[PDB]
Subunit: 458 residues, 4 copies
Amino acid sequence: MSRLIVVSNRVAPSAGGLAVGVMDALKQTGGVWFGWNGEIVGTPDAAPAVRRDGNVTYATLGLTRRDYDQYYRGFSNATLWPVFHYRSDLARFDRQEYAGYLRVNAMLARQLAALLRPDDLIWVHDYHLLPFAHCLRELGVKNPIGFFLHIPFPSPDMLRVVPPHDELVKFMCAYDIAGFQTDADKRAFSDYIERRGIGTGMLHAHGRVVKVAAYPIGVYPDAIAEAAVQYGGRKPVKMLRDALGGRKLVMSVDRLDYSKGLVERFQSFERMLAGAPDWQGRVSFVQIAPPTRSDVQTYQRIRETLEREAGRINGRFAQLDWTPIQYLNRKYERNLLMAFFRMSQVGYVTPLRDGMNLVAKEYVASQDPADPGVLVLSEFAGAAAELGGALLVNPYDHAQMADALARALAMPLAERQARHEENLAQLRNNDLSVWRDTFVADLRSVAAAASVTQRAGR
Amino acid sequence: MSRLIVVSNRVATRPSAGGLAVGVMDALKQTGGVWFGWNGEIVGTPDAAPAVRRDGNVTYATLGLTRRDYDQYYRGFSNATLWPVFHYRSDLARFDRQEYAGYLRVNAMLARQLAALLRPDDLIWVHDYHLLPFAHCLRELGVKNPIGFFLHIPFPSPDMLRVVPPHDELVKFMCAYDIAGFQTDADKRAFSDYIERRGIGTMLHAHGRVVKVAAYPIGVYPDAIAEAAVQYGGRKPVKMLRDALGGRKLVMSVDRLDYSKGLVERFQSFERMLAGAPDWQGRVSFVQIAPPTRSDVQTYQRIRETLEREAGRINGRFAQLDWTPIQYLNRKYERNLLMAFFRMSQVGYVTPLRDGMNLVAKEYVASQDPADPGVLVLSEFAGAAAELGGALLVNPYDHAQMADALARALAMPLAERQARHEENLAQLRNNDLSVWRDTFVADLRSV
Amino acid sequence: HMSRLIVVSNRVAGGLAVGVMDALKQTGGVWFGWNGEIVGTPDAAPAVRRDGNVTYATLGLTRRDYDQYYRGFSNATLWPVFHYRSDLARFDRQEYAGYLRVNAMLARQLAALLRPDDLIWVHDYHLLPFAHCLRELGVKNPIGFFLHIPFPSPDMLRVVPPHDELVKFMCAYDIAGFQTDADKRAFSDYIERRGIGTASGMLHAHGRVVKVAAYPIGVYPDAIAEAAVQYGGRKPVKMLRDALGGRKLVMSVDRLDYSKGLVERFQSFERMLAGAPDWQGRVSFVQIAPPTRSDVQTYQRIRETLEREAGRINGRFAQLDWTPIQYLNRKYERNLLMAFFRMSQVGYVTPLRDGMNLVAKEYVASQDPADPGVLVLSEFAGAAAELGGALLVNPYDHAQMADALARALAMPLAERQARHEENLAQLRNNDLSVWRDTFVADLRSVAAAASVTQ
Amino acid sequence: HHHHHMSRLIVVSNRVAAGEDTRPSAGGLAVGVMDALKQTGGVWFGWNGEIVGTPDAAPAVRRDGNVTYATLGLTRRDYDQYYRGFSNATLWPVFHYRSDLARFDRQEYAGYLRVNAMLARQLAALLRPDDLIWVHDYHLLPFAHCLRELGVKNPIGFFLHIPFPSPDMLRVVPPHDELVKFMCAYDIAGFQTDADKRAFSDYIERRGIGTASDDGMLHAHGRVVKVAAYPIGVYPDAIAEAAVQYGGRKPVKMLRDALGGRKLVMSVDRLDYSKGLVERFQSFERMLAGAPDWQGRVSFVQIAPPTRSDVQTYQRIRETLEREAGRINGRFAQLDWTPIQYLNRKYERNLLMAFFRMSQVGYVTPLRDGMNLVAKEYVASQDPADPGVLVLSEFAGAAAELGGALLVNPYDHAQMADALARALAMPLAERQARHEENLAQLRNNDLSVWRDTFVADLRSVAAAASVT
Ligand SMILES: O=c1ccn([C@@H]2O[C@H](COP(=O)(O)OP(=O)(O)O)[C@@H](O)[C@H]2O)c(=O)[nH]1
Ligand SMILES: O=c1ccn([C@@H]2O[C@H](COP(=O)(O)OP(=O)(O)O)[C@@H](O)[C@H]2O)c(=O)[nH]1
Ligand SMILES: O=c1ccn([C@@H]2O[C@H](COP(=O)(O)OP(=O)(O)O)[C@@H](O)[C@H]2O)c(=O)[nH]1
Ligand SMILES: O=c1ccn([C@@H]2O[C@H](COP(=O)(O)OP(=O)(O)O)[C@@H](O)[C@H]2O)c(=O)[nH]1
Ligand SMILES: [Mg+2]
Ligand SMILES: [Mg+2]
């Protein structure tokens, strides 16, 4: 078989992440996983480090401080990330950072080209690598190259906040396949090309033909359930169950990102306690929130605001034996988290914007079907398009969020089971295999032809 | 001929000032029409009836609002939810259910007062985001008259509008109008996109009604502005600026101190130019006229504090003993004085982050001397950017591009400056304020 | 033939009541001040109710009166400066004039109730001008003043622009009483070193003679201990006991004031947990901090800063069954607090400046002598001058505070008993009776001295 | 000729002047000490301002004629703990009565001690038995103690340029007792003012550490210390000549032409929170609000170069001041009038003198200042035929000497605004009476008195004290 070449920013089953999504395809084809090893080095690396683990080969590379600052911390995380989440107020464009972004893409692309074989299928992942296919084409690479964006793709009126948006869209048309999480994301990309006169489910633009499609990432719901049962007796689980002592449990797990709406989430739980005082002392909200991107200033500000809200809300409602919001910056093993979800009565997942959000899907998959919890889900998560059994909320409406918490906490068993079974059927109908197998098959349908009109499958 | 009924948040009167009055007065004068709305005053108890004053041929019907009305209608939902979201600032949005209910209550209270004054054939023209529910309230009172709406600010695309929690109800309210008018095509498509892509409707057919959806970009009177700029060129404030500039080039800005206007990005870009081209230090002056706005809204206090700090930091960095780099003034000036400032300047610097149209951009072009015209540096997120192809268009999130555009504007040769001004001037004469007024009134007479 | 005691204070009913009531009962005296109600128009005369032997003469205030008594000069200039916070002082001339005007209005209302031999006892910084206002109405009675908060040294006092007029006002009192010796010497230093007057412990200044003295306020330690036992079985006490589940308890009770050093306190406990990780999950810090002066911008700033620190620290160290800092904005009945103190192993009292701090004294008095807790106390509290059994700390040194917490938590029974008996003997040697009896006796000596040629 | 006639003066300070900064027209410690260094063939020892990647083995020794400069670099860790940390984040705020800005850290204090000991070890190898050692300012409180532990028996004098706070404030510094103990290792502890030396004596007497006796000598920590005040002055007649000589330089003409007849209020300050710049700006605003006829007729020029930018407290006060400049100018500016001309650039000191002379008012209102020489420099720059008015904070040490100044409490904005208006309206005769009174003070305590008096004490105290 042709090798599958996976390219992502950071090269790695219990831990989720990209590895569990792509590993079987790498193992099947004897493929390669190429990318950055997370290290900073003082001088650029001459060649990639090649480690072979059975059938899969790992090719990693270091980055300089200047690379890290301009490619990752800068343009990716201070321009693309805030804009793609509809936060133009947090965007900071810098010309030298953007040039560093392009330079790193080219450096990575030339390093990969030296490892390529003519029949390799190339699968590039996420916003760090928008230019990667374009860079490969300029090196003469004719292989099929597919792209998958894990985060939202903003509508044109928001994308334009990124100053090189036009060049970025041209770069994306170097991919034979541009995959997105949801239909809305793909429509945003198509709307940009059509409504700006750039081109006309195939897109014809910038002298190429592009397949534009949605491949919403799912999970392995049956494995998650087994893991949640297997870990139900670990010490952290007994610790939390002893602490609740019969109180109902609202559970959240989020990177401490401004995309996750943690402040709105905290204030809405406060609003529910004030409006339904009989809940005071009878429910506990646990928020596990490991820090992320601490070296980006926007993340320091959102973290300080959340800490103040935790202190203010807890000072307002705490009793001598009750902390209303248990806020923890510690990271927990993924299997423990599933057992936390199963124990809980409510999953509270209210991002202001999210490509998909797997926590929402993992929350449903952890539940006991005989006594399942309720998912309260922001309508701005990509997962809202599938999880119809969730209570959908608008996170800018704190009163609506508070009512949904109260409804979730008091919901009779029968409706909890109906909503859970509806959501569970969705997870089984679109598990992680569908994302992998469908994208891999679409890549296998592209021909490595010189005529642009011959590449496309059908 | 049926009289035109103008409905807006504030009721004005002279043509030397701008505002809605200059846009609607001649149609009110032509039709013997009525201007209905709030008199700007706050009352302790709600008024039973509107105050009716007739100034020649036009009738003014005014009413006061209570403190609670003010807090929830004007300060609340309108200015704390609609204004930030419609300007793509989801971080500044604060939705409150009680404020939104008060927004609806005030609209209905105004609507019940208007219905008692109406005639069966009156043409009703409603203006701007404070009054999205107004047509709906009138239909529920049995009003069958033609009712048109014109939105002065942008209409956000569906992914941004959804930040407003009662977004579906508001779009339903907008379909009560026979005409949904917007500044630009992009605004009209965002409204169409919501209805079509959410399966509400299919002219638009939605909520059991038929709605004409169109764009009517507001213009100006470029020949009148040019004349005023010449007539006021010798007023004392104009001489003060001229003598003080003393050969330095002049960059002019006039903006409400709104977070929509990009004042911080604008200041930092001028700093960036001075840092990158040190020869300009002492040779150019940036005048920013920025009267305060909505001072009782906390988000407006924060942007003001941030802008004052930047003025102090930047002037402290580059000022010399006879040179203040950025002259920052919180004063309001007579509109005719502004035209004389615009004409005197070499660059108009108008870089909003989001703006429904921006008439300052159009007024700036119209003031210039065609024998020696200034250059317009204009943000691509202003509605005016769709018409003023002669401007140097910039993305305000790119400080380097803004600084390069300023430097390019300040040095642009006469021949290229004249070509750009003539391109923009022709557009202004093609779509002057008459076109906006006559076309909306003509469409209303067709309902 | 016993003269009435007239008590003048902010509000007429622990607290000030327990300190002065026995003297009011003994003399058939009067307590004068504000009744807690607001009026649309000024009250003509005070409302006079007689409760057995004590008369309560109370007055309403208008919104303008209330504003310039509490909100203005007293709390925006005097309070921050006397607590060494020159950065928080906001002097305003009209506020200061309103401060004098309100004192004069209260004084004119009180003068009409006075008998020529009444003994007048004025309390705290809202009422510095009160004696002056009375003298200008012709009042010759003995008038004593007691300042409950610190008196700053002349270099800090001068931050208050009318510092000279205010000290002249204090010399209208026959007695200027302070919490500690350092406070009275700061007042003496201003008068002596600025050439205003001379000593002879009597001060001769502004043509008057003023007795300058310290009267440190105490408690009733034996009453506090009995109350702690009597309330040891209430539901809130059992709630806390059960929730601790063997964990050690560090207790704090403070108004949310910037003088209380709450931010430094939280960070020192954070530093202690960081440097001694085995304490994580084995000790809990309870901070009861009811809000105070919430409509004042300076107090909102410290409150926001403290909440953020609570959230940051708990986020750093909490476990799924352990909240490191239990921060509560609730107020508790005073008798419940004594039971909380008694249950705890450490009392944590770290003001950056405090006139006395009675919580520190209440904490010690609550303890079981068979198993007593340890007091960790800032040396900038007035109580530090008496409570030598405490672990004294400088709150600007977080490491010292963290070390003292650790030492308090591990201290053997013998040393805890030695330190506790030292603090208890002090409390019994200077209980609240001493403050009352000494000041009243001094007031009776001004009146006696007037009966005889000096 | 094997023998040296005069004992060398060894000046020890945090920063040793080099290059342009040795010139008399620059100011600083150099103009205070150079004549004694030249007279005695002395040495100036201390840090060269540089950061080195590894500690220096020995000092760099440069000779300028008769004077030797012996300097050393500091490591980043040394700099962070000695200079940025304990000196500038603990001592400086506390000694200026800002307990709210003070931040103690044990590791920083240890590095402060370590750096003092390292510097003392390097100096000890250069000393001769009769050298007179003159140590300067709060960075070096421990220096004499470290030298005594190396066996140094020389006369060592200390002069504090900043205030010494009273005991209730000094105690905010956690190692206060140790630091006072260290200060008693000096044969002389010199201060700016009587209030400063009394605060030091108050600490020792009221804490039972020692007693005062035999006229001005303190007996504490087993030593005898002369405690005295030596208020620093200026060269008023040299300042006058510089102000006239530079009256035609381009920056001066630029300012003159831009004012165009408007009155000029002049301030020069490092951007320190001790200098009261926010209160100063807001009081000028209050004057403009209360006296609108002044709008457009007077300009406030504030030259405020940045200082200690890597200390967070300095970043915050700067941000607050920038916001105030922007807000006040937005409120009152006209199209040809900037009310507050706020400049962060540094100017040649002689240019500053020509600015002071041109102005009508010197506006010098620190919340706390050891002395403040700008206030004295302002007086000296004036033309006696038409002199400007000094508006001066009572919390500057110079307030005790400049009796012709208008004294203000900067915590009272209304008084400061009134003083500005009073200064702007003052008739010539009273301006001259006040100016001549201040000028005579400057001439009768010029910079020579500070130097000759301290050097005289160094030449005699330790020896006179050895008499039984
Ligand atoms: O302490 C944590 C936090 C998160 N996760 C995992 O990290 C992923 C988070 O992905 P999601 O789509 O929810 O959001 P993202 O973090 O990618 O924005 C999920 O698989 C979580 O199970 C985890 O294992 N431990
Ligand atoms: O001191 C001022 C400030 C503004 N304007 C006028 O206010 C309008 C500003 O409208 P624009 O469309 O530019 O933006 P908006 O202020 O309506 O958001 C223009 O007609 C300006 O001439 C004025 O006359 N004087
Ligand atoms: O919720 C509370 C808080 C405080 N106190 C009491 O209030 C006093 C606190 O006074 P302290 O002298 O300690 O400081 P102050 O608050 O007067 O500055 C003590 O008697 C406490 O027991 C109380 O009864 N309940
Ligand atoms: O830009 C400036 C600022 C200050 N100075 C000089 O620096 C000293 C300031 O000392 P002062 O005692 O007034 O205060 P300090 O800065 O020492 O605290 C004076 O000699 C001023 O002439 C200077 O030459 N240029
Ligand atoms: Mg105990
Ligand atoms: Mg002068």
